[PDB]
Amino acid sequence: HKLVQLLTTT
Amino acid sequence: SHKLVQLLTT
Amino acid sequence: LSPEQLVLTLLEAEPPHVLISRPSAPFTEASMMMSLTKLADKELVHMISWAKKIPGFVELSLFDQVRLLESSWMEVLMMGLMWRSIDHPGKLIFAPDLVLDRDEGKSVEGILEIFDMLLATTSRFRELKLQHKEYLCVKAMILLNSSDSSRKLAHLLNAVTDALVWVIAKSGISSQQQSMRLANLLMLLSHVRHASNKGMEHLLNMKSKNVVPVYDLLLEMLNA
Amino acid sequence: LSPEQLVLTLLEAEPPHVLISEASMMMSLTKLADKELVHMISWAKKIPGFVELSLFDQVRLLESSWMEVLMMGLMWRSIDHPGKLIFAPDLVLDRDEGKSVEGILEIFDMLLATTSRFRELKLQHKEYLCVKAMILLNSSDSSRKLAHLLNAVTDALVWVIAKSGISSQQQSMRLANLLMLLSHVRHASNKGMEHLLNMKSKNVVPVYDLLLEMLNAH
Numbered sequence: 001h002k003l004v005q006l007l008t009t010t
Numbered sequence: 011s012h013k014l015v016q017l018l019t020t
Numbered sequence: 021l022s023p024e025q026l027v028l029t030l031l032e033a034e035p036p037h038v039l040i041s042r043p044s045a046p047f048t049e050a051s052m053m054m055s056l057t058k059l060a061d062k063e064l065v066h067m068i069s070w071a072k073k074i075p076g077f078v079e080l081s082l083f084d085q086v087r088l089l090e091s092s093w094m095e096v097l098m099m100g101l102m103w104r105s106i107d108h109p110g111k112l113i114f115a116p117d118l119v120l121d122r123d124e125g126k127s128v129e130g131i132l133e134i135f136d137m138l139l140a141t142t143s144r145f146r147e148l149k150l151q152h153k154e155y156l157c158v159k160a161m162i163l164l165n166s167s168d169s170s171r172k173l174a175h176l177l178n179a180v181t182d183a184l185v186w187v188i189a190k191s192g193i194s195s196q197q198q199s200m201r202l203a204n205l206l207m208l209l210s211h212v213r214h215a216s217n218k219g220m221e222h223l224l225n226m227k228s229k230n231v232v233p234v235y236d237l238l239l240e241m242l243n244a
Numbered sequence: 245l246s247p248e249q250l251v252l253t254l255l256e257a258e259p260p261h262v263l264i265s266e267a268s269m270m271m272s273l274t275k276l277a278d279k280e281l282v283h284m285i286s287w288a289k290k291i292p293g294f295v296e297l298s299l300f301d302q303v304r305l306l307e308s309s310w311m312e313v314l315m316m317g318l319m320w321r322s323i324d325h326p327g328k329l330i331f332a333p334d335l336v337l338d339r340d341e342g343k344s345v346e347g348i349l350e351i352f353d354m355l356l357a358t359t360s361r362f363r364e365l366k367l368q369h370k371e372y373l374c375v376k377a378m379i380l381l382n383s384s385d386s387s388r389k390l391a392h393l394l395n396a397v398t399d400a401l402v403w404v405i406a407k408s409g410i411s412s413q414q415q416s417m418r419l420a421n422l423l424m425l426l427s428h429v430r431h432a433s434n435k436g437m438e439h440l441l442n443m444k445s446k447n448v449v450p451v452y453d454l455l456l457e458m459l460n461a462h
């Protein structure tokens with residue numbers, strides 16, 4: 001979840 | 011059981 | 021576009037120094053494991069940022085991006101460490117203020133074996149006189165070689181490879197020595213990936229024995 | 245010894261085609277692996293310089309690389325037969341048949357995927373011969389002999405690529421693409437070693453002495 005968030009939300 | 015060293019020596 | 025443009029994009033994309041204090045007290049299995057895991061988790065944040073600044077990476081499928089970072093992250097950290105460590109023989113330069121000796125691996129069961137791998141490989145890179153622009157290319161290649169998006173990754177990996185072939189040529193050694201240097205650099209990457217597999221096994225061993233703290237990104241990345 | 249003399253010595257060193265003669269599959273693979281490991285030690289000893297290395301080095305390189313060297317052998321036999329792994333003439337499996345044993349479909353997919361990249365790149369026999377040797381010598385007095393042995397097989401691969409007469413740019417690009425694929429062979433052998441050590445722990449794979457010693461090393 002954290003990886004996908006940093007990839008797309010950060 | 012030492013078949014590797016044996017095959018390497020002959 | 022041009023190999024030189026791609027190299028200068030990788031140069032701009034380099035992560036900043038991650039700052040971690042050395043424990044005040046001489047290292048224990050715990051203090052050192054907490055140091056190395058805290059560093060890894062901070063670097064992982066900067067690694068995701070680095071990958072997205074590689075041209076064409078963010079045009080891959082999300083799942084391809086995820087799979088590359090999940091698959092290569094430890095090898096990428098370890099390529100980072102060997103480079104920071106290249107100018108300081110016998111030392112491992114984990115961060116500016118975390119400079120570990122070979123013998124200081126005594127403090128974690130099994131870590132000393134990992135340090136000798138890291139130090140030996142770092143010496144092979146020192147004796148090949150690894151150049152800054154070769155390192156930039158080789159590190160992206162570890163990421164993109166780990167592992168329509170399949171066609172784009174092949175292309176993006178051909179482009180970084182084209183860039184490394186260019187950097188070695190600008191060295192001006194013979195074509196035969198260009199081929200030999202390209203081969204000796206790539207065969208050294210198999211030694212980085214080996215060190216990375218032992219360290220992943222070591223990390224999963226340390227997590228299993230409690231020692232490992234709760235670490236969002238690192239944990240998510242290890243469970244991969 | 246010239247690059248051509250070295251590559252010709254590898255052609256000579258090539259083991260013969262080995263035949264084996266749910267559980268049946270896994271009995272076949274361990275039996276094949278054990279027979280192939282015998283041929284692999286003759287092959288290693290016919291690599292110019294190999295028997296000049298210290299016995300510790302000879303043992304350490306074979307112990308390290310044996311599964312990588314089997315899988316490289318498999319990929320070459322399989323290259324023309326897409327969707328097929330030509331373990332042997334009397335042992336030809338597809339991805340489906342891998343489904344029957346847990347963890348094997350994953351390994352057959354890697355081997356088949358890597359096999360297809362080598363196929364797309366049109367890996368040449370003389371290229372295969374060099375890289376397979378390099379897998380052995382690059383695993384992970386004597387140590388300097390090793391380095392010389394390894395440079396020489398690398399010079400030989402650069403030679404084989406030159407003889408295709410593609411551009412210099414393209415000789416470098418080809419060289420890189422072949423070497424990068426090797427890490428995919430090493431990954432597939434990492435997974436196979438993990439699977440095989442797991443089957444040994446549960447003693448579900450026939451006790452074979454040379455395979456056993458080679459596995460124990462890990």
Ligand SMILES: N#C[C@H](Cc1ccc(O)cc1Cl)c1ccc(O)cc1
Binds near residue numbers: 056097222
């Ligand atoms: N040697 C080492 C660690 C990886 C590691 C290995 C084993 C283990 O049990 C825990 C960790 Cl975290 C490292 C940290 C930052 C880098 O930039 C590079 C490597």
Ligand SMILES: N#C[C@H](Cc1ccc(O)cc1Cl)c1ccc(O)cc1
Binds near residue numbers: 274
């Ligand atoms: N995929 C495969 C096997 C290795 C293997 C892997 C897992 C396992 O549980 C048992 C075995 Cl024996 C092989 C046999 C001969 C070759 O030439 C190449 C590979």
